């Protein structure tokens, strides 16, 4: 598994401790590391009290499949991590939402998958755990102490979310035309009306690459060449103190704009570091997140940069005659 970006796994004591909303980007990254975002999501939506990711952190979150290309890169953000950063919103599951089969759902308290419309997360209540189907919450003494390890969290798909450059409607409609020409045998994906079909089969699991350029629905492709580029923008750097924890808003803004905070060489050319003396324990220091950059997809002729590029499991209704 990949490492923590900033902070190690949390050691929680009081299950009713309030979760604050710290403005710093590095502080948000540290919260993401400790699975504070999933705990806050469960509190807000599923009437859950306590914390997940106890003593394990984000490193050992379960994935489906276990072998995930983007999991080994720590800096790559999952849909939940993107939710905590304000990029997207993970909705609470409704009755119509579909739970994909295949993952081991026994004991899980939270699991999210990227649907054809948006992102849906399922959560179980306090003192309860999902059953093997993933459709039910049942009583469990294991999830009773109020502190749960990271093996209770499941993330579905090989997802990677990132800053998005907006694209106009004409490009999106061309991409949709390419997708519908490339997938003529699909009629519904997660209940969202795909190309017209007079005959619907039973829903089936479907593993397919997709992008979230950002519109009414996602774009799924079969052939594509994805390139990775490093821009070393301000989003690629996380600034932290010596050993205590992430820096605050003021220190982060000072180091990232004034350019008087020492760090590594990449940050030195990107922004500018402090040199000369070395006793700068109070001063923050900034490094680059362990990600291969941002994905640029070359699909359907003209190439776009998506918001989220992934390889997940969805539900499809194939055409019958």
């Amino acid at each position, epitope marked *: 598994d990949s490492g923590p970006i900033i902070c190690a796994g949390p050691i929680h004591s009081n299950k009713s401790a309030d979760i604050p909303h710290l403005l710093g980007y590095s502080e948000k990254i540290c919260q993401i590391d400790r699975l504070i975002h999933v705990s806050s999501w469960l509190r807000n939506h599923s009437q859950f009290q306590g914390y997940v990711g106890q003593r394990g952190g984000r490193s050992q979150v379960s994935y489906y499949p276990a072998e995930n290309s983007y999991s080994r890169w720590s800096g790559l953000l999952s849909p939940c991590d993107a939710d905590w950063l304000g990029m997207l919103v993970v909705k609470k599951a409704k009755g119509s939402d579909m739970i994909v089969p295949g993952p081991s759902y026994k004991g899980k308290v939270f699991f999210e998958r990227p649907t054809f419309d948006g992102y849906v997360g399922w959560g179980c209540g306090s003192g309860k755990s999902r059953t093997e189907s993933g459709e039910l919450c049942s009583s469990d003494s294991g999830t009773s102490s109020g502190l749960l390890p990271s093996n209770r969290v499941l993330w579905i798909g090989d997802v990677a979310c990132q800053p998005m450059t907006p694209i106009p409607e004409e490009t999106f409609l061309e991409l949709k035309s390419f997708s519908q020409s490339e997938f003529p045998d699909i009629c519904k994906i997660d209940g969202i009306v795909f190309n017209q079909c007079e005959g619907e089969s039973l829903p089936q699991p479907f593993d397919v690459a997709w992008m979230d350029v950002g519109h009414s629905h996602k774009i799924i492709m079969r052939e594509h060449k994805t390139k990775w580029v490093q821009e070393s923008s301000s989003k690629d750097f996380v600034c932290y103190k010596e050993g205590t924890g992430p820096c605050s808003e003021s220190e982060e803004k000072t180091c990232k704009t004034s350019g008087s905070c020492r760090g590594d060489m990449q940050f030195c050319k990107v922004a500018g570091c402090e040199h000369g003396e070395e006793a700068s324990e109070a001063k923050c220091r900034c*490094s680059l997140v362990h990600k291969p950059g941002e994905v640029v997809v070359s699909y359907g002729g003209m190439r776009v940069r998506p918001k989220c590029y992934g390889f997940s499991r969805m539900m499809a209704t194939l055409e019958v005659n």
Partner: nanobody
Amino acid sequence: EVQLVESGGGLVQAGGSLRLSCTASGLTFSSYAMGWFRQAPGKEREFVAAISWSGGDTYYEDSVKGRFTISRDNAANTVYLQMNSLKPEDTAVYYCNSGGIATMKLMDQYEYWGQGTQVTVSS
């Protein structure tokens, strides 16, 4: 099943120089940020040095900043720690661990420890 067994100890004299190594297996080396810790006789553990995944960012304890140099080699999954201008107060068992780049000084989240290398300096 993380198994990080280290080596590099001895009985170097005052002002000597020794290099310690710590091979990490069963865990992704290139993503974790490794750190070195010490244990003076009859005392708890103290943070000594740390290094980021890329090897560009390091911090030390103030008393040992003047000499130590920690560098990593991702090829053979080892993390190093140069020991320059040793002093008799440096006698301690050095333990190599991992986890987090910022949350490193606080020694509370550290499950499990390596066998450790006993480094003693004689006046």
